[PDB]
């Protein structure tokens, strides 16, 4: 019926978007990490489906939405658990070992990382610059959770970022790769991950571009979901009264558990709340208490409004195809 | 990722093109046939797959070209027999029973008739307009058959043009439907084949001055129509021959549904409705050259907004750099 998956809606447009990305990268010569000049500020929003009928809804949802990860994260009260906030929806992402990049790229630009532009930029930073501060931060985080050979393990993580064949086409990436990536984008990344109930994953949590001053970074996050070694973007649904925000804590039975903030130094961790407020637009939302009567204020970060112009938006072209195809029923 | 139909390089743009088509149909009050205002004057050409690594040249062909029908028509010496004119290539067409329209739509607009705009336009004329003259021409052509072994036949032809389920999804179409179609387009249709569907269909319900004088060219084999488009950019003549070699002589392509007075002036009619040129070709005696008639083919002219092969071509170029 409709396209069988998003990218088919305007292939020429996708190519145009992809072709713009490597030209937006600025490569300094004073040792500052390479980074995007403008495109990191873009954000996708998904269109509403409620106006359509179940046979149609079904084909749009089977086409665009990863309903398996969406159900897993919702059923654990990790995704879409606050009544105050706008729904997020998981978009299908290719599972080829480059999905961290495909999901990040879709969240901003509605296309996956099929030219390997983000993957290469990550590997180039890891391979060709001094990474001593990234290494230190990762050592600290490694020791907060046998005999470690630091040099050998660091070299392996650099190797994992390469485009070389080893979830089979590329090596899977892990936390440090997310942290380096957010510094290339100058934009925080928040990962909502599958995780065992405390009564019984470490990739979940908040990655800040700490190698830049907050004033030089975009202050709405990219929001990804993670499950079974797979990343997806979790994009906001157009709707208020509900507000665009993502909670920065999870429920844990009758208490709350802060999302992990990754790769901090010790003094940063002491002023974590202050740091979060610099790099994100942190608001407080009242939620129902699962121990005490009434209510508890929790921190959340504001999410961006859709700003990805039509001329670079597969989702807009997709929706216009939907409308055409719809009115014929 | 190299799509199997030109339109899929940009499905959003395909929809825009299809949406333009019914609005371009003019529907007179005085009983004259409904007809396109402007869009009938568009022509698609295919891009060259040489000037690519033959390895990659071959990836595109499996993607876009109906090579089964190209080889059949070429081995029968009907398609691309003449070494003096440009090569024509058969584009893949949906075989759902609406392929006459999918092929015709693709030749002009690079999209298939998937909203049924042309198919509905045909049925509308046959079920609404009067068609007295069409039926007469059809009777005359039908009675030329030297032997006959008969009149619910006209109503069933009308029914065949409907969008009703028959079998494929739609009823297959025949010669008379081609003739009505060329008059809705005000543009000749030429069908290359080995149903005697092959030949030339002229929009004779219109004076030639109101018609577009480059043809639509289709191929036909095994109940299936495809467009035969010009391959873009050597120095061969941009024209389709109006004869074939047949047993050591040149035989004219059939011209369909003419009246007696029209038949007596067939060559003059061809010269009014087409751009006829007289070109030299090699004889069977290699010491001899012959002049034959050919009709000029149009140059590619689909504008930016609804030009689609350029979008497909851009995809190809991006993919090829990554392939080098
Ligand atoms: Cl776990
Ligand atoms: Cl976490
Ligand atoms: Cl020849
Ligand atoms: Cl011969
Ligand atoms: Cl013929
Ligand atoms: Cl001869």
Curated annotation (Swiss-Prot), chain B:
Active site: 96, 99, 224
Region listing for Interaction with ubiquitin, in residue ranges: 172-174
Effect of substituting residue 96 to A: Strongly reduced deubiquitinase activity
Gene: TNFAIP3
The OTU domain, residue ranges: 88-231
Impact noted for substituting residue 224 to A: Loss of deubiquitinase activity
Reported impact of residue 102 to A: Reduces deubiquitinase activity
Included range, full protein: 5 to 357 of 790
Residue numbers spanned by region TRAF-binding: 54-267
Impact upon substituting residue 172 to A: Strongly reduced 'Lys-48' deubiquitinase activity
This protein's name: A20p50
Native species: Homo sapiens
Localization per record: Cytoplasm
Domain of life: Eukaryota
